[PDB]
């Protein structure tokens, strides 16, 4: 019934072969001690471009036909998706345009430019960039690259699930952050197809959690009050495909506070020597919050460190 | 090679296997992923061994724990003593806590406040004394004579070397087809342990050491044929600021270490920046030495189209210093 299947993920594994490589997943001393169970950290912060998003973007772009590639590609993002698309464009020789707001974090702009794609600065908000993307699609015929709501993107993300089970046969739980739901949807399909006894559990911020609201509600729903330290997961409404998949496969979704995200970031950097952005600390925030204690005690749990694209100045600011 | 080592060197594979047994269920294997950035730069497969993520933030828990756990109950009751301004202090202090052993650690006045704090938080009594290492050694000597405590050497000890060597076993478990292992050197305990483990299992693997240009007693000794002191000045790689190598470690290194290369302060800094910004891990200067050698071009003949492990030996550096280097 689902719009993505295990075969799509195995196709992605084939496309990524020799181009995108497996990230580390070591046991954590600190988290294992705190949580009274074995906690493993999946280092997607050490994936190319500093987050997992290269996987889905590279799978989508590589899966394009020659004629589709020649049309050029377009995206809108002021962070991790921008970088994933840009590098994929360089790796594949595809012509790319990435739209951002008029004045977005300078670290992310030069990184996106350095990765090859043309950056177009436009608008005072994300709505305005989508509008500009809409113009670029209509006027230039470029192919839009969705950040989550696309079967190839979901399939790319799912390669992470394969790696997890390759490295740790007897895993009990996989804890995953959610924005639009591509990461968890992909991982869920991979994990549940191979071993459905493994629990797949999502995490979002209290301040903004469209997917969680949808999950609780039983239909696609919007939820946002304000932004979050987990800015990569600041998504008010989930994808159509990703919600469909999450509704069926995900075992639960928990919410964590801004303080819990902060604490998790501090633990990861201070006690695990791992640089994470807010969204990359969400899963570990859930672990430290106590909300997963019944699942994790005396068991084996993988926590996704989804990204590390944050300035050290910002890390210092948050640590205090 | 295993037999040659066992007969002719002061530490051998058996000692490393004993250490594995003492550490089992207490000290766990650290990650060793492939690095995108370093593999791209080096035109070969580079893997990073994350001892920065070991208990206490460096590998030094391994040797300390093995040494302390190896003591008889009578020896443990005498209490122990060490001197260090950082990683060794933390390793000894935690080991004492884990084993219920009474420990006294002498640190120089003006050792970083986070490091002194970290050593106090575990268990051991911290004695602040002197403005240099020699001063803390002098106080240790007083404590040993007056209190009868057992001194815990930071490298020049068979049990410490053997504990360090468990890293070698993990490398071979995770990457049996590794070609090279690149290891920082201060006193030589880390590399001596690793070399014994690696060369005993597959002697075709190259084990190469790295030290700072600014201070490299082990390198000087290796190139001259006798124990020799070298120190020009301090270094970013403070964990490897050791002007004269150990006796046991020099003996092992001269037999089993293929080469020792030197890196500049700029090279260390560049490597720290790469690890932090491109690999998202916190490393201290000494933890970046092996990667500095790799980026320097000084290992280029060994690393293309091959599998190379780089030891990230420690992560005990203040966020302010990291933030300064990055910023
Ligand atoms: Na040599």
Q: Helix or strand or coil: residue A24?
A: coil
Q: A313 with A36: CB under 8 angstroms?
A: no
Residue B52 annotated in ligand binding: no
Cβ–Cβ < 8 Å for A286, A255: no
Ramachandran class of B315: left when φ > 0, alpha when ψ lies in -120 to 50, beta otherwise: alpha
- Of A89, A120, A148, at which residue does a domain stop? A148
Give the sheet arrangement for strand B307-312, strand by strand: B45-50, B307-312, B180-184, B206-212, B259-263
In angstroms, the CA A68 to CA A63 distance is: 9
Whether B319 and B223 share a structural domain = yes
Per the CB < 8 A criterion, the answer to whether B165 and B72 are in contact is no
Question: To the nearest whole angstrom, how far is the Cα of B220 from the nearest Cα of chain A?
Answer: 32
B60: annotated active-site residue: yes
CB atoms within 10 A of CB A271: 16
**How far apart are the C-alpha atoms of A32 and B135, rounded to whole Å?**
39
Separation CA B258–CA B67 (nearest Å): 27
CA gap A293, A281 in Å, rounded: 17
Asked if residues B63 and B161 have their Cβ atoms less than 8 Å apart, the reply is yes
CB atoms within 10 A of CB B131: 10
Distance CA B115, CA B118 (A): 5
Residue B243 and residue A181: Cα distance in Å, rounded?
55
Burial of residue B46, with CB atoms counted within 10 A of its CB: 0-12 exposed, 13-18 middle, 19 or more buried: buried
**Pairwise CB contact (< 8 Å): A22 & B34:** yes
Q: Say which DSSP state B10 is in.
A: S
User: Given its phi and psi angles, is residue B148 left (phi above 0), alpha (psi -120 to 50 degrees) or beta?
Assistant: left
Report the DSSP pairing between strands A73-76 and A96-100.
Answer: parallel
B122 assigned to a ligand binding site? yes
Q: In sequence order, which ranges of chain B are alpha helices (DSSP H)?
A: 2-8, 13-23, 36-42, 61-70, 73-77, 87-99, 113-122, 133-147, 158-174, 189-201, 217-224, 247-256, 265-273, 279, 289-296, 300-303, 319-326
Q: Which of B155, B174, B206 is the last residue of a domain?
A: B155
Provide residues of A within 8 Å CB-CB of chain B.
Answer: 21-29, 43, 45-48, 50, 269-270, 272-276, 308, 312-313, 315-316, 319
Q: Measuring CA to CA, which residue among A249, A254, A248, A242 is closest to residue A188?
A: A249
Q: Check whether residue A267 and residue A183 sit in a common domain.
A: yes
Instruction: Looking at the structure, tell me whether residues A91 and A123 fall in a common domain.
Output: yes
Residues B141, B263, single domain; the answer is: no
For residues B171 and B274, state if they share a domain: yes
Q: HSE, CB side, 13 Å, CA atoms: give it for residue B248.
A: 21
Q: B206-212 and B307-312: which strand pairing?
A: unpaired
Of A148, A181, A216, which residue is a domain's last?
A148
The residue annotated as part of the active site, out of B60, B67, B159, B206, is B60
Identify the three-state secondary structure at position A306.
coil
Domain containing B84: what range?
Answer: 59-155
Starting at the edge strand found earlier in the chain, the sheet holding B150-151 runs: B125-128, B103-107, B80-83, B150-151
Q: Does residue B307 have an active-site annotation? A: no
Q: What angle is formed at CA B38 by the lines to CA B33 and CA B40, rounded to 5 degrees?
A: 110
* Residue A271 sits in the same domain as residue A226: yes
**Cα distance between residue A109 and residue A103, in whole Å:** 9
Q: Return the residue in B41, B54, B280, B307 with the most chain A beta carbons within 10 A, the one to mutate for interface testing.
A: B280
The residues, any chain, with a CB within 8 Å of residue B83's CB and separated by 6 or more, are B89, B105, B106, B107, B133, B136, B137, B139, B140
Q: Which two tokens stand for residue B127?
A: 């004695």
User: Catalytic residues of A, which ones?
Assistant: 53, 306
User: Residue ranges of the alpha helices (H) in B71-132?
Assistant: 73-77, 87-99, 113-122
Residues B129 and B147 in one domain: yes
Query: Which residues of chain B does A310 touch, with a Cβ-Cβ cutoff of 8 Å?
Result: none
Alpha-carbon gap, residue B283 to A272, rounded angstroms:
11
Yes or no, beta carbons of B323 and A315 under 8 Å apart: yes
Which residues on B lie below 8 Å from A47 (Cβ)? 36
Are residues B307 and B175 in contact, defined by beta-carbon separation less than 8 angstroms? yes
d(CA A203, CA B15): 46
As a whole number of angstroms, the distance between CA B61 and CA B92 comes to 7
Resolution of the PDB structure in angstroms = 1.7
Contacts of A310 (CB under 8 A, 6+ apart): A275, A276, A277, A278
Query: Coil, strand, or helix at residue B276?
Result: helix
Residue B294 near residue B182 (C-beta atoms within 8 A)? yes
Same domain, B252 and B327: yes
> How far is Cα A101 from Cα A120, in angstroms, rounded to an integer?
8
Non-local (6+) Cβ contacts of A260 within 8 A are A285, A286, A288, A289
Name B209's bridge partners: B183, B260
Name every residue whose Cβ is closer than 8 Å to that of residue B190 and which is 6 or more positions away in sequence. Answer: B59, B155, B164, B167, B183, B184, B311, B313
**DSSP string computed for B27-78:** S-PPP--B-HHHHHHHTSEEEEEEGGGSGGGBTTHHHHHHHHHHS-HHHHHT
Query: What's the B230 CA to ligand 1 centre distance in angstroms?
Result: 19
Residues at the binding site of A for AMP are: 48-49, 83, 114-115, 309
Same domain, residue pair B186 and B292:
yes
Kindly give the distance from the C-alpha atom of residue B253 to the centroid of ligand 1, in angstroms, as a whole number. 9
Rounded to a whole number of angstroms, the distance between the first and last alpha carbons of chain A is 48
Tokens linked to A177: 């952050």
Chain mean position to CA A210: 15
Those residues with Cβ within 8 angstroms of residue A89's Cβ, 6 or more apart along the chain or in another chain: A61, A73, A95, A96, A115, A116, A117
Can you tell me the distance from the alpha carbon of B198 to that of B194, in angstroms, rounded to the nearest whole number? 6
Residues found in chain B: 327
Residues A118 and A2 in one domain: no
Structure tokens at B229: 């002191």
- Quick one: A255 and A269 in the same domain? yes
CA pair distance B104, B92, nearest whole angstrom: 9
B219 CA to middle of ligand 1, Å?
11
Residue A109 to residue A127: CA distance in whole angstroms: 18
Running DSSP on this structure, what letter comes out for residue A44? Answer: G
Ligand 1 centroid to residue B227 C-alpha, Å: 16
Q: How was this structure determined?
A: X-ray
Per CB-CB distance under 8 Å, the chain B contacts of A272 are: 53
Instruction: State the Cα–Cα distance between residues A152 and A144, nearest whole angstrom.
Output: 13
CB-proximal residues (5 Å) to ion ligand 1:
B 259
Among left, alpha and beta (phi > 0; psi -120 to 50; other), residue B227 is beta
Give B327's contacts in chain A (Cβ within 8 Å). 312-313
- Burial of residue B24 (number of CB atoms within 10 Å: 0-12, 13-18, 19+): exposed
CB B230 within 8 A of CB B278: no
Are residues A227 and A167 part of one domain?
Answer: yes
Chain B neighbors of A315, CB-CB under 8 A:
319, 323
For B320, other C-beta atoms within 10 Å of its C-beta total 11
Among partner residues A23, A26, A312, which is closest to B327 by beta-carbon distance?
A312
What CATH code is carried by the domain that includes residue A276? Answer: 3.40.50.1100
Q: How far is B171 from chain A (nearest CA, A)?
A: 13
CA distance B123 to chain A (A): 17
In angstroms, how far is CA B10 from the centroid of its own chain?
18
Out of A21, A45, A319, the one facing B319 most closely (by C-beta) is: A319
CA of B190 to the centre of ligand 1 (A): 18
Quote the number of domains for chain B.
2
Give the three-class secondary structure for A58: helix
Q: In terms of C-beta density within 10 A (0-12 exposed, 13-18 middle, 19 or more buried), how is residue B269 classed?
A: middle
């Amino acid at each position: 019934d689902l719009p993505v299947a295990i075969e799509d993920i195995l196709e992605a594994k084939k496309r990524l072969a020799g181009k995108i490589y497996k990230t580390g997943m070591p046991r954590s001393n600190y988290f294992s001690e705190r949580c009274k169970g074995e906690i493993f950290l999946k280092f997607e912060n050490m994936q190319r471009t500093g987050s997992f998003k290269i996987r889905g973007a590279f799978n989508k772009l590589s899966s394009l036909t020659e004629a589709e590639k020649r049309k050029g590609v377009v995206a809108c993002s002021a962070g991790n998706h921008a970088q994933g698309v840009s590098l994929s464009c360089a790796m594949l020789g595809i012509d790319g345009k990435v739209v951002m707001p008029k004045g977005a974090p300078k670290s992310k702009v030069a990184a996106t430019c350095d990765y090859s794609a043309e950056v177009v600065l436009h608008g005072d908000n994300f709505n305005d960039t989508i509008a500009k993307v809409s113009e670029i699609v209509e006027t230039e015929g470029r192919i839009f690259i969705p950040p989550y709501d696309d079967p190839k993107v979901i399939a790319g993300q799912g390669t992470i699930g394969l790696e997890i089970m390759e490295d740790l046969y007897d895993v009990d739980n996989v804890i995953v952050p959610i924005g639009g739901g591509g990461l968890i949807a992909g991982i869920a399909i991979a994990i549940k197809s191979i071993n459905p006894t493994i629990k797949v559990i999502g995490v979002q911020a209290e301040n903004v959690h469209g997917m969680a609201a949808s999950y609780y509600t039983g239909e696609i729903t919007t939820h946002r009050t304000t932004g979050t330290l987990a800015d990569g997961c600041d998504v008010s409404r989930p994808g159509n495909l990703t919600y469909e998949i999450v509704r069926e496969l995900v075992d639960d979704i928990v919410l964590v506070s801004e303080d819990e995200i902060r604490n998790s970031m501090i633990a990861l950097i201070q006690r695990n020597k791992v640089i994470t952005e807010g969204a990359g600390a969400l899963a570990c925030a859930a672990l430290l919050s106590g909300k997963l204690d019944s699942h994790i005690q005396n068991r084996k749990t993988v926590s996704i460190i989804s990204g590390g694209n944050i300035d050290l100045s910002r890390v210092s600011q948050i640590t205090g």
